[PDB]
From a paper:
Addressing the elusive specificity of cysteine cathepsins, which in contrast to caspases and trypsin-like proteases lack strict specificity determining P1 pocket, calls for innovative approaches. Hence, we set out to determine the crystal structures of cathepsin complexes with representative peptides of cleaved substrates. As a working model, cathepsin V was chosen because of the resolution of diffracting crystals (up to 1.3 Å) and crystal packing with accessible active site cleft. Reactive site mutants C25A and C25S of cathepsin V were used in structural studies.
The pattern II group (binding shifted to the non-primed side) consisted of structures of nine protected peptides and one non-protected peptide that all bound uncleaved into the non-primed sites. At P4 and beyond, the features of the electron density maps became weaker and less precise; however, it was possible to model the peptides KPKKKTK, RLSAKP, GNYKEAKK, and EVCKKKK up to P8 in the averaged kick Fo-Fc omit maps. The pattern IV group (binding of cleaved peptide fragments at primed and non-primed side) included structures of two peptides, LLKAVAEKQ and RLSAKP, which were both bound along the active site cleft of cathepsin V. LLKAVAEKQ was designed as a hybrid containing the LLK-fragment from the LLKVAL peptide, which was cleaved and remained bound to cathepsin V on the non-primed side, and AVAEKQ, which bound non-cleaved to the primed side. In the structure of RLSAKP, the fragment RLS bound to the non-primed subsites S3–S1 and the fragment AKP to the primed subsites S1–S3′. The distance of 2.6 Å between C of Ser at P1 and N of Ala at P1′ and the continuous electron density between them resembled the LLKAVAEKQ structure. Overall, their electron densities were weak, and the fragments were refined with partial occupancies. Peptides from patterns I and IV bound to cathepsin V consistent with the observed protein cleavage sites, whereas the peptides from patterns II and III did not bind according to their cleavage site found in proteins.
Numbering used by the authors: 1 to 221
């Protein structure tokens, strides 16, 4: 596998978004993964609608602004036959009536692939071969809220009890040795002002830190 990967440098990733006061990170994680796969398939980067997922995927088990899961979102896109663009179905950060319009669909998936649970090496293979990967993590810490620089490492982090969905866009390392001081490149949905331009480096190969490889998945397009 490559010593480092950064799908942002290849055009696969949209600018950082902001979920605001709605518990929809699962939807931003899912649109980010679908944006990358649609780019890999067509060469066009098109921002996708989180609101479409918030409003319409209750049957699949999502709860809108009260939480959800990325795999359930990919399930909805498969069952639904499509997903609207951000532009045609704008984000308003509250639960609303489903307004899915097939004529505005710009994405599709046939299901999704699961990374083996807990395997950082398996997550590394998927990031390297596929593109950006949806992942769950434990983000419930002030140290995460005020993250700014460096490789994030929080002793209080759980690898099992997770509460946030994010997007792994690559991986890398500090210094000249590719085998140490490793990190995951993670896209958040708290706006560009949060973190490092909306991104965070999470410690890699430090026993599945914050659960990054516990529940990872990507859409099949
Ligand atoms: Cl999931
Ligand atoms: Cl840094
Ligand atoms: Cl940056």
């Amino acid at each position: 596998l490559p010593k480092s990967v950064d799908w942002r440098k290849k055009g696969y990733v949209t600018p950082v978004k902001n979920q605001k006061q709605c518990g929809s990170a699962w939807a931003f994680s899912a649109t980010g993964a679908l944006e990358g796969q649609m780019f890999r398939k067509t060469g066009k980067l098109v921002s996708l609608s989180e609101q479409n997922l918030v409003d319409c995927s209750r049957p699949q088990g999502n709860q809108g602004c009260n939480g959800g899961f990325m795999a359930r979102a990919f399930q909805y896109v498969k069952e639904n036959g499509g997903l609207d663009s951000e532009e045609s179905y704008p984000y308003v950060a509250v639960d609303e009536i489903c307004k899915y319009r097939p004529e505005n669909s710009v994405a599709q998936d046939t299901g999704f692939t699961v990374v083996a649970p807990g395997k950082e090496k398996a997550l590394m293979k998927a990031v390297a071969t596929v593109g950006p990967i949806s992942v769950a993590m434990d983000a419930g810490h002030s140290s995460f809220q005020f993250y700014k620089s460096g490789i994030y490492f929080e002793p209080d982090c759980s690898s099992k009890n997770l509460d946030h969905g994010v997007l792994v866009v690559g991986y890398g390392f500090e210094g000249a040795n590719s085998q140490n001081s490793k990190y995951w490149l993670v896209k958040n949905s708290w706006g560009p002002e949060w973190g490092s331009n909306g991104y965070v480096k999470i410690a890699k190969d430090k026993n599945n830190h914050c659960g990054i490889a516990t529940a990872a998945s990507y859409p099949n397009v």
